[PDB]
């Protein structure tokens, strides 16, 4: 074998060659990504098992088809699967799913993305044991489809602002669910359109006209034989969308729709009788950018273009400057989120606020830029990126579906007033680098190291001194005599970029914690490779707040960027194997341009010629129309 | 009688309250936008016009529609619009009928896209007074459907790298087609697919062995009464695509297929039976003016959480990290639109160099703001009933940054050999010396000419900067080709920082030229706020030589923020002055009245999946799983 384990004999050679430079093993590197060499090990095992079933793989390639045959086709290997899974996977393991999930049902959705995604986890959390023996356990054996319906046309995000109520009648031990009006109506829960006959419903609770807040309750929505949506039930799908179509979000709404006193969900919460009232989404951006990153790359190496040196042949895209720039940094992101991602579960454990407030910065910058490098990998591949061929818009426009980085806003000010009032000792560990003595300048490249630790010392500065500017200018308008509210506003824009910062100065201390950790030797200069791209890349993308109080010097800044154009050209002999290791079969990652064979142009013709519109020589646009016009004329 | 002429009776209140802080007429901003009162007052006349012809509007939705049914409702406006066209509008003129064609044909494409836009213009300048005759005059007649074929599946648009060749047989006065490989495919003319019957094809002409060249050929494809592939044609449709899919785009291949001599195009060359041988700019800031007056009119009628705790929920638009996320763009729209009337002011009188910067600095900063404006919208953003994320990907489907960068490495040149003087006027701001600082927020006044004064000093810094890198690298003994890799990232910066400072230079001539007074305040304050966000945005080249002080930063902070609230006001009068109408604009976020929450209900209510009650997939699959179960 070859270190890279994903060459194959008749692999175009184009493509080999970007593989047979790889310095480790990409199994090694596998173990590395999905934490484990079992781990690792179980998804290839999947992957091979499932190529011996045939009646679970797409009947057609899934962009020849509208959006009810997608539909149908989902429902088609979903009830296959609730029948084979265990011939294939171990059911319990969470990550066995996962994977066979994204084999099997892609990313454009199915009919039961949220019965085990918010459904059945409320019933864990929400309802009483008595309640569990009678839902929950129907939801797990299928009997049922739920959902979970919180968001509303009118208000989406705070449970504070939602209008649906659920006012219990004490004469008949009911409670009466209603929609008050058109913007009350839930409004996006996946798979409430059309699919589930059952959701747990978040409504403000009404006791003798006092509210309670938001509680949730289950609901019935389709009688069990019919499927017609029962009497006062308003129910429906809200149309198409850019992307994610399988799914059938809903729109539900109620007539003074009533339903016993015992489907308020009541493991936390009582309401007797007569009333009384007793009281890894990370790692899902990170697959989906290095799907579009697995599809750019490999394109790239074996698509040719344009000359470098006049005496010598066109050169593969993969050599450009400009294109190892506009790729290469993103590959570093998407080992970086991976990380960030185990490094909050293994936060998240050893509590045994800090995190609450960081997991909402987390979510919003993730999110955000892997869309900006989704779409980067989009235009790398030229024009044959815009065709569904490169599947990278679809993968776009799945990862991409303001609050989250003003919470932790708040907690950055909170933790500035600390500073600012002498509690500096009071900081949490993530926020403590706040209360902490910056040197008068960055010491990179002014101080021998061997040292990244360098660099986090300057995105701590950049961090802090940003969140301290914008705190102060939020308590100097105050002290000006604004309303608090009001200054708050005319702050967050500043607020935000703290946020931001924060957010990223995370995302790479976790990174350079990973790096230091691993033993394995092959492995850790890759990884560490990739880490020195991602710092110099990011720290040049914020250089201003370095270069604003002097903190970083002109000088200092080129050797950044030299530094980046150095690591660019160091990464490329690994950039394909990075990528390779996180191991997606083509089943899986379902695009032309990104074949792990490297074969795109034999492939991308075949494509075409079996595409829907090439079924007759002559359209009916032709027939119909435009023939009878040419011969008109 | 507002000076915002949108307004309606019956409007969404909160819709009209923010058309009614209006400071200037919107007729009069409009004629300022596409031109003169005449142009404006024409688009909206095409406008009503088309009310009263319901034959030409959309059946329905055009996303409950699959790209089959899209097709066919194309082509049948497109039936409809041959006959009719000439009671609506001047087809001679290229304004009108591009205004028609978006009122009635979208932004996704129509089957005879490049049989006006290609096919019948590469007639005009190839095709001799005798070929015209037989085959330009049948094109204008749309007898037959046209386009124009040369990017091929492996090489795109460079001729000299094409590989399909036509061989002249002296023995039968025929030019022999062929495609050698698979890579020789035509591969992505719009039209080719499926619609055109005939196109104009590029390809290698050989002779008695030796290779003149690309030449172009009218090329029959299809049979005039059946419509099928003659005889060693291979064509067919490439397949769907993220965005624009009323298009049929094509492969095309030929197996030895034979054309007489006379099928070459002989206007400039000419082959005897012997052997011998003798804009765009605006289509983005409409595109990025689509997409803000969706999220922008969406902005004044969605209301979300309190600012002060004591009042009502706030309409969004109040929010200053909303109008940071709106606003900018407004000004980019406009300044997209006024760098594209210069680029024509210029050419009708180092301009073809810089024609290669703003394609690309355009189409990518209106990509980063249709993307923006989805955002701004929210959940409802992800719906099609936002519109803005076709509107983005027609949008993106727009080496032009290198062409700029040999320009400006050669300018460069001349400054460091002392030949500043032989600058272009559009470049000599290279040879010009700095003042030690930028002088914002220093001098009495200065104004908007000491911010084109910062921006000319960091784009002369980081195109000589740059040069320098690509020049250090070949005295170290460097292979020219290979120093310019690897110098290619930095180049980039440098063209798209001089790109980016015309566009700053054009809108501020524009304003300059001004004379009523109400529509010149308003675009001011625009620019103002263009300065200042484009200033920051470029923070990093104005810091790293001292040039910029961290107080002078927050000078432009201050003004940023101040401008975004003097903007608002105006925010919606400045969109709707682009006068776009709800069958053009085809949003539901964006309709003109701001009733959003009724029609966005109507529009998921009738809704393809919404035809039963139970789905198919529930009927065979689904509710049998449940029962087993």
Same mark, same amino acid.
């Given at each position: 074998?070859?270190?890279?384990?994903?060459?194959?004999?008749?692999?175009?050679?184009?493509?080999?060659?970007?593989?047979?430079?790889?310095?480790?093993?990409?199994?090694?590197?596998?173990?590395?990504?999905?934490?484990?060499?079992?781990?690792?090990?179980?998804?290839?095992?999947?992957?091979?098992?499932?190529?011996?079933?045939?009646?679970?793989?797409?009947?057609?390639?899934?962009?020849?088809?509208?959006?009810?045959?997608?539909?149908?086709?989902?429902?088609?290997?979903?009830?296959?699967?609730?029948?084979?899974?265990?011939?294939?996977?171990?059911?319990?393991?969470?990550?066995?799913?996962?994977?066979?999930?994204?084999?099997?049902?892609?990313?454009?959705?199915?009919?039961?993305?949220?019965?085990?995604?918010?459904?059945?986890?409320?019933?864990?959390?929400?309802?009483?044991?008595?309640?569990?023996?009678?839902? $929950?356990? &129907?939801?797990?054996?299928? %009997?049922?489809? =739920? !959902? @979970?319906?919180?968001?509303?046309?009118?208000?989406?995000?705070?449970?504070?602002?939602?209008?649906?109520?659920?006012?219990?009648?004490?004469?008949?031990?009911?409670?009466?669910?209603?929609?008050?009006?058109?913007?009350?109506?839930?409004?996006?829960?996946?798979?409430?359109?059309?699919?589930?006959?059952?959701?747990?419903?978040?409504?403000?609770?009404?006791?003798?006209?006092?509210?309670?807040?938001?509680?949730?309750?289950?609901?019935?929505?389709?009688?069990?034989?019919?499927?017609?949506?029962?009497?006062?039930?308003?129910?429906?799908?809200?149309?198409?969308?850019?992307?994610?179509?399988?799914?059938?979000?809903?729109?539900?709404?109620?007539?003074?729709?009533?339903?016993?006193?015992?489907?308020? $969900?009541? &493991?936390?919460?009582?309401? %007797?009788?007569? =009333? !009384? @009232?007793?009281?890894?989404?990370?790692?899902?951006?990170?697959?989906?950018?290095?799907?579009?990153?697995?599809?750019?790359?490999?394109?790239?190496?074996?698509?040719?273009?344009?000359?470098?040196?006049?005496?010598?042949?066109?050169?593969?895209?993969?050599?450009?400057?400009?294109?190892?720039?506009?790729?290469?940094?993103?590959?570093?992101?998407?080992?970086?989120?991976?990380?960030?991602?185990?490094?909050?579960?293994?936060?998240?454990?050893?509590?045994?606020?800090?995190?609450?407030?960081?997991?909402?910065?987390?979510?919003?910058?993730?999110?955000?830029?892997?869309?900006?490098?989704?779409?980067?990998?989009?235009?790398?591949?030229?024009?044959?990126?815009?065709?569904?061929?490169?599947?990278?818009?679809?993968?776009?426009?799945?990862?991409?579906?303001?609050?989250?980085?003003?919470?932790?806003?708040?907690?950055?000010?909170?933790?500035?007033?600390?500073?600012?009032?002498?509690?500096?000792?009071?900081?949490?560990?993530?926020?403590?680098?706040?209360?902490?003595?910056?040197?008068?300048?960055?010491?990179?490249?002014?101080?021998?190291?061997?040292?990244?630790?360098?660099?986090?010392?300057?995105?701590?500065?950049?961090?802090?001194?940003?969140?301290?500017?914008?705190?102060?200018?939020?308590?100097?308008?105050?002290?000006?005599?604004?309303?608090?509210?009001?200054?708050?506003?005319?702050?967050?824009?500043?607020?935000?970029?703290?946020?931001?910062?924060?957010?990223?100065?995370?995302?790479?201390?976790?990174?350079?914690?990973?790096?230091?950790?691993?033993?394995?030797?092959?492995?850790?200069?890759?990884?560490?490779?990739?880490?020195?791209?991602?710092?110099?890349?990011?720290?040049?993308?914020?250089?201003?707040?370095?270069?604003?109080?002097?903190?970083?010097?002109?000088?200092?800044?080129?050797?950044?960027?030299?530094?980046?154009?150095?690591?660019?050209?160091?990464?490329?002999?690994?950039?394909?194997?990075?990528?390779?290791?996180?191991?997606?079969?083509?089943?899986?990652?379902?695009?032309?341009?990104?074949?792990?064979?490297?074969?795109?142009?034999?492939?991308?013709?075949?494509?075409?010629?079996?595409?829907?519109?090439?079924?007759?020589?002559?359209?009916?646009?032709?027939?119909?129309?435009?023939?009878?016009?040419?011969?008109?004329?």
């Amino acid at each position: 074998v070859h270190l890279n384990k994903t060459i194959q004999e008749g692999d175009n050679p184009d493509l080999t060659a970007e593989r047979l430079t790889a310095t480790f093993d990409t199994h090694a590197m596998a173990a590395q990504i999905y934490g484990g060499e079992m781990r690792a090990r179980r998804r290839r095992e999947i992957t091979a098992k499932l190529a011996e079933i045939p009646e679970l793989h797409d009947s057609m390639p899934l962009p020849y088809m509208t959006r009810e045959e997608k539909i149908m086709e989902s429902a088609r290997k979903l009830t296959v699967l609730t029948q084979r899974m265990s011939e294939i996977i171990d059911p319990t393991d969470a990550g066995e799913l996962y994977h066979l999930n994204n084999e099997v049902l892609g990313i454009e959705g199915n009919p039961m993305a949220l019965h085990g995604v918010m459904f059945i986890p409320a019933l864990n959390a929400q309802a009483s044991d008595e309640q569990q023996a009678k839902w $929950l356990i &129907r939801a797990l054996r299928r %009997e049922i489809i =739920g !959902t @979970y319906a919180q968001t509303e046309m009118g208000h989406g995000t705070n449970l504070q602002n939602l209008e649906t109520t659920a006012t219990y009648d004490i004469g008949t031990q009911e409670f009466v669910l209603h929609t008050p009006k058109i913007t009350a109506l839930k409004w996006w829960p996946g798979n409430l359109g059309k699919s589930s006959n059952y959701a747990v419903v978040v409504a403000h609770m009404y006791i003798k006209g006092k509210n309670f807040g938001p509680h949730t309750f289950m609901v019935p929505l389709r009688d069990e034989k019919t499927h017609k949506p029962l009497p006062g039930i308003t129910i429906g799908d809200i149309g198409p969308k850019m992307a994610y179509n399988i799914v059938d979000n809903g729109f539900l709404g109620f007539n003074n729709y009533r339903i016993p006193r015992t489907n308020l $969900l009541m &493991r936390h919460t009582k309401v %007797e009788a007569d =009333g !009384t @009232y007793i009281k890894y989404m990370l790692t899902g951006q990170a697959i989906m950018l290095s799907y579009a990153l697995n599809i750019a790359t490999r394109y790239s190496a074996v698509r040719r273009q344009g000359q470098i040196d006049k005496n010598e042949p066109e050169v593969k895209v993969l050599e450009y400057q400009t294109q190892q720039h506009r790729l290469f940094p993103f590959i570093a992101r998407a080992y970086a989120f991976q990380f960030a991602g185990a490094e909050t579960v293994k936060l998240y454990e050893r509590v045994l606020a800090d995190l609450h407030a960081l997991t909402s910065g987390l979510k919003s910058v993730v999110t955000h830029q892997t869309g900006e490098g989704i779409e980067q990998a989009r235009m790398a591949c030229g024009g044959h990126g815009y065709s569904m061929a490169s599947y990278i818009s679809e993968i776009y426009g799945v990862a991409i579906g303001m609050v989250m980085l003003l919470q932790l806003a708040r907690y950055l000010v909170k933790s500035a007033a600390l500073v600012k009032s002498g509690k500096a000792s009071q900081l949490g560990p993530l926020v403590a680098y706040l209360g902490a003595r910056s040197e008068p300048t960055s010491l990179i490249d002014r101080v021998p190291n061997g040292g990244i630790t360098e660099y986090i010392k300057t995105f701590q500065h950049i961090a802090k001194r940003q969140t301290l500017k914008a705190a102060n200018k939020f308590f100097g308008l105050m002290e000006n005599g604004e309303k608090r509210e009001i200054a708050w506003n005319k702050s967050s824009v500043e607020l935000n970029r703290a946020s931001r910062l924060h957010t990223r100065l995370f995302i790479v201390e976790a990174f350079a914690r990973r790096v230091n950790e691993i033993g394995d030797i092959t492995i850790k200069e890759a990884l560490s490779d990739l880490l020195h791209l991602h710092v110099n890349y990011e720290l040049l993308d914020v250089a201003t707040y370095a270069l604003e109080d002097g903190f970083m010097s002109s000088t200092q800044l080129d050797y950044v960027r030299d530094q980046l154009y150095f690591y660019l050209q160091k990464i490329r002999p690994n950039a394909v194997s990075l990528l390779d290791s996180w191991e997606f079969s083509d089943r899986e990652l379902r695009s032309v341009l990104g074949r792990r064979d490297g074969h795109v142009y034999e492939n991308l013709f075949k494509w075409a010629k079996e595409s829907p519109l090439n079924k007759t020589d002559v359209l009916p646009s032709v027939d119909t129309y435009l023939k009878p016009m040419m011969e008109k004329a």
